[PDB]
Design a protein around this ligand. Structure first.
Ligand code: A1BIA
Ligand code: A1BIA
Ligand code: A1BIA
Ligand code: A1BIA
Ligand code: CU
Ligand code: CU
Ligand code: CU
Ligand code: CU
Ligand code: CU
Ligand code: CU
Ligand code: CU
Ligand code: CU
Ligand code: CU
Ligand code: CU
Ligand code: CU
Ligand code: CU
Lengths: 125, 125, 125, 125
């Protein structure tokens, strides 16, 4: 089993009020659903990702990332977000991320295809 | 089946000489392996991601993303990369991406945890 | 004079304890000094940048950016950071930024030349 | 005078057809004008930035960055772009950059305030 498998598995919330539901597998897999409180999104979207299942023991965080394509049974926003970050355990566990949101564009609009931002996830709120 | 399921599935190469082997599923899943020609990496790493399986028909690209955690049977670089981008079909098919590489760090080093860059993948080279 | 010339001019502090001293000119110029609490840096570095001197009046923030090259009389870290963001006035004024730190590299190391992060500046601390 | 003062000073063009006119000062300053071939922009905009005026001599590039606020006498797009990158001299001199474009937004739209991309500048085209 992964070092932080139990620490990562569960329900997380970011500063926007979005809900990140994830299961960390012993093999390094991340699976679950994402519900965004903002943007062209409603209800849950499939997510998949990976995490370091044997992290350093020097107090460093645990690197991880995941992807949502913004298509479900309700809506298709023709776009995908990837979150890249690290899990930090302890009393106030956190997943600190930066993200890249790419829209499908024509080639003439490709220069403005990608948004960047940062989300912090906690176990509360 | 996804609109670009056949277009995306296969072997891709980026400008560094890295090899991206991916299968696009009818459900929007991306699965496969990544081999980086640079950095603290050797041989293949598991990847997983998502793509828009019903993209726009106005000539826009197909949004997608995937994650590699840099742990395999040979090495563990305690880090993860996410690629966010779009697939562009046609004679010279391309996957144009930007990426975020996060290292697990102490909190004192978290400000410098994340590298950003851009990779273009083609079916040749 | 710029709409937020007086709001922006002054001393700001980010979450790392770095000090951003800036003067906003009527013409859209930003001038001043930056002192980083972290990294290969000591004492003050020259900065220059630009801001929107006639922002929207619909409650939107004021877009701005600036650059530091990490060379002064004490040290040269062969690198430059740019901050891109917006000023938000009011009781708890803030400058919310994302930044790109590029190191001079050989071409073989150029893929890992750039760090990305986010700093929030306030008038206190 | 800066090591690459003469190498950097002049007219540059990126892959979009935008024109970057810059003067590198002996003190590390960058001054000039930017004309974007795309987006909410017409004619020239003021730019200012900084570069490493005493770079490494091991073949590494020269770190630099600059800012444009997208306001001039013709238009105001209430936004600013910062380019962060490095100058690479030689027969085919290049300035390789990544950039952050921030729009002034309401707080409700701040999550989508920032675009990210990459521009390569050459002395031809
Ligand atoms: O809302 C969505 C899906 C929901 C996204 C929610 C985000 S994930 C990161 C963050 N954390 C979170 O919990 N929730 C948010 N997806 C399309 C987003 C529309 N774009 C316009 C289309 C377009 C056309 C042409 C060029 C570019 N886009 C947004 C505008 C924009 C700004 C900057 C860069 C790219 N796009
Ligand atoms: O090599 C690796 C794994 C291989 C990465 C290969 C990359 S994926 C994007 C690109 N496309 C590709 O095909 N191949 C490359 N992983 C650790 C990378 C070491 N870092 C030092 C550790 C550290 C300690 C403290 C703070 C930050 N890192 C790299 C240095 C760095 C620079 C900037 C930002 C973050 N880290
Ligand atoms: O410390 C510095 C100067 C001080 C930077 C302070 C930063 S500004 C953003 C932030 N807000 C703030 O208030 N303070 C910090 N400058 C070089 C930074 C060394 N790098 C290693 C050299 C190298 C060699 C080869 C490839 C890449 N770098 C850092 C490691 C790194 C990680 C990821 C991407 C790039 N570089
Ligand atoms: O065109 C401009 C000014 C010209 C920009 C030209 C760019 S510089 C980088 C690149 N290299 C170059 O040579 N030329 C381009 N400036 C506003 C740009 C409108 N935005 C909509 C407003 C808005 C409202 C709410 C939230 C976000 N924006 C663009 C859409 C967008 C997508 C993603 C992230 C942010 N904004
Ligand atoms: Cu949009
Ligand atoms: Cu280890
Ligand atoms: Cu978009
Ligand atoms: Cu490293
Ligand atoms: Cu559609
Ligand atoms: Cu690293
Ligand atoms: Cu370093
Ligand atoms: Cu206006
Ligand atoms: Cu560096
Ligand atoms: Cu726009
Ligand atoms: Cu030196
Ligand atoms: Cu915008």
């Amino acid at each position: 089993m992964g070092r932080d498998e139990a620490g990562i598995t569960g329900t997380w919330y970011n500063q926007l009020g979005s809900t990140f539901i994830v299961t960390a597998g012993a093999d390094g897999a991340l699976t679950g659903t994402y519900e965004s409180a903002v943007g062209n999104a409603e209800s849950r979207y499939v997510l998949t990702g990976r995490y370091d299942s044997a992290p350093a023991t020097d107090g460093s965080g645990t690197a991880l990332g995941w992807t949502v394509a913004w298509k479900n049974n309700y809506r298709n926003a023709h776009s995908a977000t990837t979150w890249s970050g690290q899990y930090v355990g302890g009393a106030e566990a956190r997943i600190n991320t930066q993200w890249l949101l790419t829209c499908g564009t024509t080639e003439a609009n490709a220069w403005k295809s990608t948004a960047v931002g940062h989300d912090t996830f906690t176990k509360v709120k």
